[PDB]
Amino acid sequence: TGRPEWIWLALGTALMGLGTLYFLVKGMGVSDPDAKKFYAITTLVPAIAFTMYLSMLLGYGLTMVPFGGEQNPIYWARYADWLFTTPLLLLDLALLVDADQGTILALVGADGIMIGTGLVGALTKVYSYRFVWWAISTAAMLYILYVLFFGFTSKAESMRPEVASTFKVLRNVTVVLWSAYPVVWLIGSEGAGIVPLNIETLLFMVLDVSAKVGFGLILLRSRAIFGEAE
Ligand SMILES: CC(C)CCC[C@@H](C)CCC[C@@H](C)CCC[C@@H](C)CCOC[C@@H](CO)OCC[C@H](C)CCC[C@H](C)CCC[C@H](C)CCCC(C)C
Ligand SMILES: CC(C)=CCC/C(C)=C/CC/C(C)=C\CC/C=C(\C)CC/C=C(\C)CCC=C(C)C
Ligand SMILES: CCCCCCCC/C=C\CCCCCCCC(=O)OC[C@H](O)CO
Ligand SMILES: CCCCCCCCCCCCCCCCCCCC
């Protein structure tokens, strides 16, 4: 507990753990193949986040990066988390709307670029170059958001109203929450260093729990995840 941000890492660990356990129990008994997919993806997201929050709490997921002539604490474990959880979250959305495979690959590929370039930016030793990587990552994010709003144009006249409804809600949650991440990065200690690491950790920890457990609660409560069955 020598790091001030430990409390947010602990709490994050606890909230992701407990969310995982709730989604394990809730999904118990589900036989519908379509619903099984959504429960698998959506359980599985906070399970990964739990391990990476734990890893940060215990100090494994932290490294020191020299830039600005200082040794800067960088939690690299975030990117290991997001590398897997953010395409899984996009897959939830894509499966909802029965997205084409081409569209799914575009989303997951862009996502991979977003997280990969975020990681390179996070570990870059030349200060000004960190923001070049930030810009590229943000461009990838904007591409993803574009596809979410303008890429499911063929899947509207055949979509079940509850699918459309739950998708629209989850898409809005996604755009609002995901758009905050580049802002937090930019102002936090990985970027401009105007907001201290402890507040920077609090902000991510609220975004993460909201984007994974919050998102999951909304999705797994909806009839949208079930095939139409009599
Ligand atoms: C998709 C789903 C169906 C399934 C996915 C779920 C599952 C695979 C996810 C579990 C997540 C988690 C356990 C991942 C563990 C990361 C670990 C392997 C990284 C090892 O890094 C080595 C340490 C040295 O001690 O570097 C520490 C110090 C270094 C000098 C600092 C720099 C390290 C790098 C920045 C690490 C980059 C993180 C990569 C994204 C990890 C890639 C994942 C892969 C190798 C497992
Ligand atoms: C079965 C039924 C009708 C309801 C069960 C719902 C349950 C039990 C959910 C539990 C999951 C859990 C223990 C935690 C995650 C809940 C998280 C959210 C709703 C997202 C919001 C959380 C935050 C924004 C972070 C909290 C912030 C601080 C400062 C503690
Ligand atoms: C201490 C509290 C910690 C609690 C957290 C520990 C999490 C990490 C470890 C193991 C389980 C990983 C399994 C997660 C994947 C489950 C997928 C699933 O739920 O699948 C349902 C689908 O219906 C099936 O066909
Ligand atoms: C269909 C309607 C589309 C909804 C668009 C909403 C896009 C708004 C994006 C919000 C950007 C958030 C940036 C705020 C940063 C503050 C960081 C702390 C957050 C906890």
Side-chain angles (χ1 to χ4, degrees), residues 122-185:
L123 295 176
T124 281
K125 295 179 179 179
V126 183
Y127 187 66
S128 50
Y129 295 165
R130 299 176 66 84
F131 301 98
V132 173
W133 294 110
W134 180 89
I136 294 167
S137 180
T138 297
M141 190 195 70
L142 291 173
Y143 177 78
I144 290 163
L145 298 182
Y146 176 77
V147 175
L148 292 185
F149 281 99
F150 297 98
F152 306 159
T153 43
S154 33
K155 333 269 157 182
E157 283 184 0
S158 95
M159 205 171 268
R160 299 134 51 178
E162 75 276 14
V163 162
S165 177
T166 300
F167 170 72
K168 169 185 205 108
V169 170
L170 291 174
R171 178 173 63 183
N172 289 337
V173 169
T174 296
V175 177
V176 173
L177 293 182
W178 287 38
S179 295
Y181 284 80
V183 179
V184 173
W185 197 102

Side-chain angles (χ1 to χ4, degrees), residues 8 15 18-19 22 202 205-206 209-210 213-214 217 221:
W8 313 123
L15 291 171
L18 288 169
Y22 175 75
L202 167 59
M205 192 262 263
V206 171
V209 174
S210 298
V213 181
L217 285 166
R221 279 202 204 263

Side-chain angles (χ1 to χ4, degrees), residues 16-18 20-21 23-24 27 30 35-37 39-41 43-44 47 50-51:
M16 293 302 182
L18 288 169
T20 301
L21 291 175
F23 291 159
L24 264 164
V30 174
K36 284 175 146 188
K37 283 180 244 293
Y39 270 99
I41 295 169
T43 302
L44 228 201
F50 160 82
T51 67

